[PDB]
Amino acid sequence: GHMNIEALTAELDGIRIEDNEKIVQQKSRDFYWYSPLLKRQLDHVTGDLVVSPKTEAELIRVLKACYRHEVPVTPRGTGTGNYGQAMPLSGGVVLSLADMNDIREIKPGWVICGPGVICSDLDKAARAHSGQELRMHPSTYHTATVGGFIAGGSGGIGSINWGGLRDFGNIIRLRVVTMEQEPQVLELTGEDLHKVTHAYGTNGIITEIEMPLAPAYDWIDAMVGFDSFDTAAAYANALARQDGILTKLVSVVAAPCPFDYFKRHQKFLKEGQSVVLVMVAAQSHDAFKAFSARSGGEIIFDATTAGDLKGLPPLFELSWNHTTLRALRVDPAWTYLQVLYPFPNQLELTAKMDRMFPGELISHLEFVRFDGDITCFGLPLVKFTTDERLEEIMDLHNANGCPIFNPHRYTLEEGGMKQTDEIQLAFKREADPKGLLNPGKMIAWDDPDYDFNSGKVWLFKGLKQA
Amino acid sequence: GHMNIEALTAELDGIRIEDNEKIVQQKSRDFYWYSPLLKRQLDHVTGDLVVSPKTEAELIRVLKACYRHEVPVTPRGTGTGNYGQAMPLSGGVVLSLADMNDIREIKPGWVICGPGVICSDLDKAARAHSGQELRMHPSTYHTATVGGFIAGGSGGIGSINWGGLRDFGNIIRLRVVTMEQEPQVLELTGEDLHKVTHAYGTNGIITEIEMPLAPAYDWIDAMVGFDSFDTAAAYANALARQDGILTKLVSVVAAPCPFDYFKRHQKFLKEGQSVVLVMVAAQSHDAFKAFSARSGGEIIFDATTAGDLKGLPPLFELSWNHTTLRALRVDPAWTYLQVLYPFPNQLELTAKMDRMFPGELISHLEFVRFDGDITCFGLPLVKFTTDERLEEIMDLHNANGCPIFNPHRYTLEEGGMKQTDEIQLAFKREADPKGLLNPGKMIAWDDPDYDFNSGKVWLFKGLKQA
């Protein structure tokens, strides 16, 4: 309970605020509980107030009042993150951007919108306007905001074509408001916007996004079935390398996950079958069938031949961390890892990890472009037993050439994605000199003795060059 | 064969025919003369008449009459091939498809049209209709037909994104009419259409094409200048690997070719400078600038800053075999090779060839997707001296890990792209039992002893396996 809440509230007349304990608690939590460790470590976290600005002017009024009363501010889109990113470690204000949902420009190849736009609503507008859609979106498409995807996410559906938010070009411009005595507006383009990507809101509030757009095609859901995980992974790798077959998703989900946890599609599945989830553009569908017939890929579900699709979720809601959701809804002991299998050894590495952890781990791959190669990331399911065994499983992945981005952590550095360097530290001081933006999420800000120059493989490498 | 030209002509009343010697001679030649060897070997080739059907029904009348009166038929789009593909080795009919140029359907992601449509005309229509365009096109964009591209070409602008016509999905369907007593209409989909791709019209006439479409963007021309070929190639490889920076062309042209032969752009160039030719989508242009600043790439020409300049060719008319056009326009002694530098060793290999042939060869790379990797093909310029030295340069490329697709040959097999296998031979026997379609272009048809299972690296691999 921050000491200055009464005075801060008195300065916010006319701005929508909420101090009801139950609502504040709900809006102080994301999906951190996918991690048993975070579920325990973050159980006591709650804010003091939820503040919901409608416009950038209201946001500036809120930040100015929080700065002068030194009340921490933790941004929130819609709170669908998995690492506790939007959770206020120091209490204070949960700053919801959900009402800043303008969509102000759609052009051939790009869109300009506010941070609170839900991904699926952005696509609804871009499709109606000119048959366009986002290049990539999280499997939380229907619930997650664009601003929270940029500040807290990394990629997802469409990464097979475009890579991820780590890559130049997948975001065009970020307009950011600083936490200063007089909040400043920064228009970040070029490499500068990459200081903000996956920074958990610690270096400014995104108030406008310019992102590229891609063509909205008739994407056809298909599942390809296999009697082993290795054969499924080999097929998915080969399909992902078909440069003329346009896909939006290529996932591998190892048995027993599909038959056990993909309940609505169960009529298309059988016990022991691993599956490859595919979204294929209608103009590439015939070639996909011809390639699959040549490549030993049995199509066990095709949205164009399956008949009545009523009640079936889109295959993307069986992919990415939706795969984890489907498993933990049936058995809550399942958690997950985040893994890279570096090119060109991804088939051998995924198989080795699969064999190393029988029963305890269920393999799950997502094929993506990564540094110009086609490879796969992993979201393997892990049956939680003890904290120590979970750390050991992750240590073993790292020691066997499969870098881990630890999702059982709530800080930037320990999560393995957003590298801290001198430029990141200088920018946080520029955008948040008092350290009021999402405190506790950046270890190097709190600890001048912390060695931020360790950590091997970073998904979002820092800007500083050699 | 018992050719009867008079009886053929009598059966074609109502169909446009040309027998003027000068016109027939012109329409019996392509750009074979880019090769000094082909210029000498094919100098005396001419047809007997040009027949120009306007409908598939007229085409069927022509083939039926040519079968009966044993008149060879050599298809022609607009005759921009480089290997003599459309040249009638046995005289007879030059079958022009230039008037089978209807545009039938444009939908999200696909087009249906006739073989005679010029690539730029197809794009002009698809852009006006729904902001779409071809995935790929040859540098002869404004002159070449789509049907001739499929039957005689391989890739080009856009291959950086989509691979080649060799790849599943870059063509959807080919409607083909056979040379049988009653010509048969085949609708080729799946793998079957790949029997006709790059077959030089030897196994049927394409009468309708269904190909995918891609989004039309504001493509920005830019040139990036370097003081050495190797640094230009390293930059271009890195740019090609930026998965979020959407490009349509990434070419490397070694000094002294740009300064000597890119005359209209001379004010932007300097002596000694190698160049990377880039087409970057407007929504990726700012990211391209930021990447270039971080990657040692000096932008020496940029269409967004150059102004509305008339008389400047698009950069793609300095790329692919337009680079060769420009060189031989100034010095007719230049010819070219076609090379693959196999992934992942393309930088090592291109440098080794560049240094092995100083002065006599000028390096030229085109970066493309190939089998799922990003690598480059080569169109190096070679100063012609003797036939023996030209053969030797190609032998040395092959012996140093750089497969040659020999452009100084006019047969399918000797050009290294279209492999003959038992499936290809059987299909010509089905579609052209009398051997009247483009005779002399397929060695295995005339040579029973031909070991068509030799050769190493084929660009268009046969359909047969296991």
Ligand SMILES: Cc1cc2nc3c(=O)[nH]c(=O)nc-3n(C[C@H](O)[C@H](O)[C@H](O)COP(=O)(O)OP(=O)(O)OC[C@H]3O[C@@H](n4cnc5c(N)ncnc54)[C@H](O)[C@@H]3O)c2cc1C
């Ligand atoms: C089932 C499931 C599947 C998922 N699949 C994916 C996936 O495929 N890919 C993926 O990347 N993620 C995935 N996620 C994670 C998450 O859903 C997405 O990253 C999502 O886009 C986050 O947006 P949000 O609005 O929920 O952000 P929140 O959770 O509200 O916030 C995320 C972070 O962004 C910050 N933030 C939010 N808005 C702003 C702003 N305007 N300015 C500055 N900082 C801000 C918050 O402080 C926090 O640090 C998944 C989660 C679940 C539960």
Ligand SMILES: Cc1cc2nc3c(=O)[nH]c(=O)nc-3n(C[C@H](O)[C@H](O)[C@H](O)COP(=O)(O)OP(=O)(O)OC[C@H]3O[C@@H](n4cnc5c(N)ncnc54)[C@H](O)[C@@H]3O)c2cc1C
């Ligand atoms: C300067 C220059 C640059 C070039 N750049 C490229 C490049 O980047 N990429 C590339 O791939 N090529 C390139 N080429 C080669 C050529 O321009 C293209 O391949 C072009 O698309 C061929 O089409 P066309 O209509 O000119 O065919 P033509 O030359 O008329 O014919 C080509 C072949 O197709 C056959 N054919 C034509 N129409 C049909 C039909 N309807 N049915 C069956 N067979 C048919 C002909 O018999 C012949 O075998 C270039 C050539 C030049 C001179």
